[PDB]
């Protein structure tokens, strides 16, 4: 009887571990999604940053004359 009790406890514990595992896996999918989205936003920002340098260079070229 005691051995069956501890067996049931072990089953509950391992199912808790499994549910934590797949919850973490779904959280991983989520965080990877935000990682892609945020790199995209930062790439747009740095593209705008690089665009300004060319415009200011052109302004300097036109102001030299």
């Amino acid at each position: 009887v005691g051995r069956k009790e501890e067996l049931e406890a072990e089953v509950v514990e391992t199912q808790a571990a499994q549910i934590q595992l797949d919850k973490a896996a779904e959280d991983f999918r989520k965080l990877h999604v935000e990682r892609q989205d945020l790199i995209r936003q930062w790439e747009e920002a740095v593209e705008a940053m690089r665009h300004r340098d060319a415009a200011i260079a052109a302004a300097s070229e036109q102001f030299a004359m």
Partner: protein
């Protein structure tokens, strides 16, 4: 905004006896049926009008019928401390018991007193003008709860139709159970609860015993201790219809908000803080802690570990001084936790209602007065464990056709025995199919 109660069977009547005490105390009604004169608590000129009438000359009467076949419990109530509270005709008592026989309670004896019970329901509901719905209390471990209860649900759904039916049904505990032939009655009552109740809040006994021995610290509890906290849960659920609050939640969106499918309606109930009169003042009880204590696995009124499946829809009722900000923060933390995973198709899972009435207290109870309380009703997918567990030990009996003669001697058939068996099979299959 009026709701009526019907109590069927020993468990139903006893829970109602331990609940109407709380109701009258909460609204300040004296046990003899009239409010006092000089003492004045709260403003409730229509806050009493939900569960109680008012017979003109200051004598409130509850909107409830108790009904039994074994007249012992009913006349115990009739001679108890609430002789005057009840109407002398809402307490219906037949002659002979059903004796753990769904067939005897639903076919032979049941069909001779439901005609009076539902007539009383008719000429009780004619007295209201804002009726919301019914709520039933029954144990499916016996005859009166299963048989007469299923018959009354059938003949009330066919009569009043659209109105909601909040069931508060006591399933047997997995291994602890007084009755022995009770799995048969459990499946027979399931095959009527599935298609005739909009929301069926489950209640168990080992779970409540575990609660009242771990948190409440009462190592020798009893039914007078179980029914008190069951009544606490009922009152926390139905407080909004009686008390105004920051965010009132009424009976329609418990269905339009917690029942994503026409058949997947099975509630796990929880209540925090289940606390004693010694730990109470030594613990700082705020929204975050009470919510975490509500959501811990070993705080559910039904013994099933809600880690196997996923949560489909949670509803949290708060009583007492709680602000929207900290409850929003608490549910945010609950979502952030790593132990519970919500179902995928339901991103927003919680609905929080709030009320300004602090939890009541019964002199002579174990739950000390507290500033606030939370009651959760959660539609989950971890009830397939319960249903399959009962199914296996039904099959064990049914293989040998044991006890079946007691049923066929009153009108059952192996046809509907197998029908209820495959009905449970279909229900658990539906849970498996919806979980994915």
């Amino acid at each position: 905004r009026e709701v009526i109660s019907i109590h069927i069977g020993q468990a139903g009547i006893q829970v109602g006896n331990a609940c109407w005490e709380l109701y009258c105390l909460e609204h300040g009604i004296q046990p003899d049926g009239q409010m006092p004169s000089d003492k004045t608590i709260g403003g409730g000129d229509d806050a009493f009008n939900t569960f109680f009438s008012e017979t003109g000359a200051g004598k409130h009467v509850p909107r409830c019928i108790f009904l039994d076949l074994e007249p012992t419990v009913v006349d115990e109530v009739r001679t108890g401390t609430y002789r005057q509270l009840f109407h002398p005709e809402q307490l219906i008592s037949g002659k002979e018991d059903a004796a753990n026989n769904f067939a005897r309670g639903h076919y032979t004896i049941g069909k001779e007193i439901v005609d009076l019970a539902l007539d009383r329901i008719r000429k009780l509901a004619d007295n209201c003008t804002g009726l919301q719905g019914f709520l039933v209390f029954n144990a499916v471990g016996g005859g009166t709860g299963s048989g007469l209860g299923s018959l009354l649900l059938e003949r009330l759904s066919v009569d009043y139709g659209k109105k909601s039916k909040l069931g508060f049904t006591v399933y047997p505990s997995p291994q602890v159970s007084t009755a022995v032939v009770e799995p048969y009655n459990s499946v027979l009552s399931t095959h009527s609860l599935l298609e005739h109740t909009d929301v069926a809040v489950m209640l168990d006994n080992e779970a409540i015993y575990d609660i009242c021995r771990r948190s409440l610290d009462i190592e020798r509890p009893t039914y007078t201790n179980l029914n008190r906290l069951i009544a606490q849960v009922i009152s926390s659920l139905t407080a909004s219809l009686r008390f105004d609050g920051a965010l009132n939640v009424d009976i329609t969106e418990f269905q339009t908000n917690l029942v994503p499918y026409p058949r997947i309606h099975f509630m796990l109930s929880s209540y925090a803080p289940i606390i004693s009169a010694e730990k109470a003042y030594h613990e700082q009880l705020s929204v975050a802690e009470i919510t975490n204590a509500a959501f811990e696995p070993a705080s559910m009124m039904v013994k099933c570990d809600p880690r196997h499946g996923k949560y489909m829809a949670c509803c949290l009722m708060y009583r007492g001084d709680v602000v929207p900000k900290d409850v929003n923060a608490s549910v945010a933390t609950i979502k952030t936790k790593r132990t519970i995973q919500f179902v995928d198709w339901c991103p927003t899972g919680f609905k929080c209602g709030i009320n300004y009435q602090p939890p009541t207290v019964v002199p002579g109870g174990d739950l000390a007065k507290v500033q606030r309380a939370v009651c959760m009703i959660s539609n989950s997918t971890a009830i397939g464990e319960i249903f399959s567990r009962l199914d296996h030990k039904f099959d064990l009996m049914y293989a040998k056709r044991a006890f079946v003669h007691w049923y066929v001697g009153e009108g059952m058939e192996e046809g509907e025995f197998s029908e209820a068996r495959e009905d449970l099979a279909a229900l658990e299959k539906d849970f498996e199919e919806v979980g994915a």
